[PDB]
Amino acid sequence: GSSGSSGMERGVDNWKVDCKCGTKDDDGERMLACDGCGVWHHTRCIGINNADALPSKFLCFRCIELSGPSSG
């Protein structure tokens, strides 16, 4: 998967707004929180337009592996 170069708990309020583009706050394009973790993403980047409705649940790439019996 992708890798990280930097990051820290400081900047955007609770609502986690992150995307490949590089947005940290509501720019203007509709977004949706990942039912899995709870991160707002660009409904467009993910591949969705206002035209169609929103998916009951949307999981991110990080969740794909996050989801598990892993107690720790």
Helix (H, G, I), strand (E, B) or coil at 40: strand
Query: Is residue 21 a contact residue for Zn ion (CB under 5 A)?
Result: yes
Least CB distance to Zn ion at residue 10 (A): 21
Q: Are 42 and 68 in contact (CB under 8 A)?
A: no
Only segment of 7-15, 35-43, 48-56 that touches Zn ion (CB under 5 A): 35-43
Residue 41 buriedness (CB in 10 A; 0-12 / 13-18 / 19+): buried
Only segment of 8-16, 50-58, 62-70 that touches Zn ion (CB under 5 A): 62-70
Query: Is residue 12 a contact residue for Zn ion (CB under 5 A)?
Result: no
